[model samples]
Target: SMQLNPESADLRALAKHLYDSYIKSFPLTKAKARAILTGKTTDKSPFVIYDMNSLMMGEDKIKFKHITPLQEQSKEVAIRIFQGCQFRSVEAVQEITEYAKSIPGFVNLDLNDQVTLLKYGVHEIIYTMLASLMNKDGVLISEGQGFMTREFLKSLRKPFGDFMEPKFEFAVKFNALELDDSDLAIFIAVIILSGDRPGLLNVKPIEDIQDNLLQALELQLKLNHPESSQLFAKLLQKMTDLRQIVTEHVQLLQVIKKTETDMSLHPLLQEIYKDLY
Candidate 1:
């Protein structure tokens, strides 16, 4: 039902476009970076602990059953997913960082403004592109190593499941649109080009840029999803939904940050959360 080919020429071109976009120079000066990511000033060298064994026994660990008619809640899968999320998120932001540099007016912004856009925008872009990882079954594990079952994920310990399950639901619905790689490229570009990110030095030009992309994206969606006249509207709505999902994700991270004092959140992910709060 959904078509994805790693070796497809169009896919390769789309990937190359995104990859090339990253080499541009929209830089965040040290002072600006430090000010926005002030949470980094905390003594924890790295905020997240990836090693399950290194985490506090009851706090970070979860108990899961192999076969469950009624799966008891556990954090095992949730933490694994968190670790995977951290892994994926870093890589995603690295790409976003590069792409931002390539945007026409982005380099013209003040360093503080640049980092501000990135700090707030990265998660939205990350979740948008991450739609590629979803299916009717479940979302992909980091590096595409495997798929984690949705049922298993919902079985994760209380709030942990609460954090991810809705994302899966949203991702699955987005995936149903059957966007090809190029389609997703356009969508992600729109996410990155948004003028609405807080603390932008100037919003008018960014909004202008976003408007142009939105026009182009609307044209592309019309051409791509010709059978569905409403797909473009649906996609716009999904972007709003994605923001809400990221909001919840930040809330979950806040909860974990407070409760799991012994373990750390990866510094980058922690900064993303802190910037939002």
Candidate 2:
């Protein structure tokens, strides 16, 4: 989260919205935000949304770690995790590498699968940690030949939680606070995505929400990696064509809210509309 002067109007407005969306009520002007969020209440904290790394690591040392693996796949996984952390640098990248040297999966996979596993593992840790945030019953990691179960996901629901909406996932878990300004841009993008569906999709950007979650993932990658950054820059330039299209889409949603039969919208949308009391 970006630091704000308590007296700043923009910061104050943003702070009030944080209270409304994440703490008090939901805000759903945007489409991508609604995909993963669950409920209508936003958090009430006066401060900006908490950045995990900034809170955990200090400001100076954020983005201090980046893993460079000895094996090719490991290197790729490391980069994914690194970008996931927003291209932060590390003092012990070598140490992290040496520690994983003997793991069976470390040396045996292609780059893509390795990146997948890296995300899998990082999300695994996050899902595990988040289980502690709200009282959840689902297990984090898989055992034997199977993985997460439907019953398990059901068990993870909240009484007020986004009951049937999309669940969150990330390509890799990265530390943000330690790095330069890079991670904030990516975090802002996700936060804006999270900002949609302010009513239900409780802060969680669950996988089921956005069709282009991978594109967002790719955007984060481009922010840091030189090769991809250049390519994404060109892609962003093309989106100028959508300026009018996007403005009209917002109008359409408002019209749908006014003219459409309540039953015509999805059940979850109805719930979010009615229950935002």
Candidate 3:
């Protein structure tokens, strides 16, 4: 059924109409009656009487806690600690994808090329998101026994100290060296769907990623295999549509300053924003 609103309707009228038409639906007239009959909610629960100002204040406090470093260290040191974790190198990524495609899950694939989906795909994405934010603030992202808390580092150093001076070579590398903008955005996607805590990455609700990867695969197939060009004709059309939505969501924030509410956000708000985040 179609819905429309009379221009002369006031805020209350419009809201009720909108809610009834879309939410309650035609057959659900009884529900609409209940909402309209009670102009004001009786329950004083936090949700029924949401306070915008209080919410804004609380959000500001949480945002600070989430971003502020627990330690009073320099930005470079913080950033180095955050960036020291390893990522799948480009070559390693390719090799891993090749191995995945060889399995039965990827059988009958003409391209035989997979993006190397693996365990902790979402987990890595989550880490990437945290790393990006921590790096931007100059808190170094790192792993290994050397760069942790003093107590943690000392515990490892005493036991492993015997091997430290011998023949073992300690190599420390940063994941940021190879990560790109798209990779970072994907990481943000994982973060938004999940939370920004440390744990094994849990990525379900696969609709978005599944759709995106399918489009990417179609694009690859069309550009390389002439014979299947017609087979993916519909996917080509879908890619065009997906690209428009993706492009709009990605670029919309740049013009956010033109929006009234954008200015009130914190100075670092821009830093934390990423597509799908």
> Where does model 3 exceed 4 Å of error?
1-123, 130-177, 187-209, 213-277
Looking at model 1, report the run of 10 residues with the lowest lDDT sum.
25-34
TM-score of 3: 0.20
Alpha-carbon RMSD to native, per candidate: 13.2, 23.9, 22.6
The digit string of per-residue lDDT tens for model 2 on 1-277 reads 3233453444334333332332111121122122222233262211111233322232233322434244422432212222222221121122223322222233343444333322222222222222222212121111111112223334432321222112222111121112122222222222223213323323233322222332443434444454443444432432332233333433444554565333133343233234222
Stronger candidate by TM-score (1 vs 2): 1
TM-score top scorer: 1
TM-score of 2: 0.18
TM-score of 1: 0.69
What are the lDDT scores of the predictions, listed in order? 0.61, 0.28, 0.29
Candidate 1 vs 3: which has more lDDT: 1
Rank order (by lDDT, best first): 1, 3, 2
lDDT of 3: 0.29
lDDT of 3 by residue, 1-277 (tens): 2123343233224223333332311221223223322334352212110233432343343222223444423333222222222121222233333433332323332231222133223223323322322211121111110112222212332222221111111101122233323222222222222222223233232334344434333333443446543544543343233334434433443444453231222332232233233
Give the per-residue Cα lDDT of candidate 1 at 72: 23
